[PDB]
Design a protein around this ligand. Structure first.
Ligand SMILES: Cc1ccc(N(C)C(=O)c2ccc3c(c2)N(C2CC2)[C@H](C)C(=O)N3C)cc1
Length: 123
């Protein structure tokens, strides 16, 4: 079974649209989104489709770029650090569940290097 996806809307939450959060959506996420290796990370891991019933027994804080994109489009975050933390959870989950040298890890490593290049300087 797949768990419910992470929440992307929360009215009880203080929201903000800072210059950096706009940049994280308009330039950072949407550059990463078009990368040739982005597709595994554009939605939650479908453990049912992959027949990996073990994935959510190991990864207890799932995150993906589809969730992040929705959060940004809902002004879910208070600051850019919260959004950057979600990206880093996504990469770290991949490094936890898989092993160095695995194909999915090469993909995440390529995406993470681009991510770090783009957030090195924020508005
Ligand atoms: C090289 C590769 C890439 C994509 C897939 N396909 C079809 C996925 O749907 C998929 C999406 C996301 C992940 C994964 C598969 N893998 C599994 C491959 C170990 C683990 C759970 C993971 O960490 N992520 C992020 C299969 C192989």
């Amino acid at each position: 079974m797949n768990p419910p996806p992470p929440e992307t809307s929360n009215p009880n939450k203080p929201k903000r649209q800072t210059n950096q959060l706009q940049y994280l959506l308009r330039v950072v996420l949407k550059t990463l989104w078009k990368h040739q290796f982005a597709w595994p990370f554009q939605q939650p891991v479908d453990a049912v489709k992959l027949n990996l019933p073990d994935y959510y027994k190991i990864i207890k804080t799932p995150m993906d770029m589809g969730t992040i994109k929705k959060r940004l489009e809902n002004n879910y975050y208070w600051n850019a650090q919260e959004c950057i933390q979600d990206f880093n959870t996504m990469f770290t989950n991949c490094y936890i569940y898989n092993k160095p040298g695995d194909d999915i890890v090469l993909m995440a490593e390529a995406l993470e290097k681009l991510f770090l290049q783009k957030i090195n300087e924020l508005p």
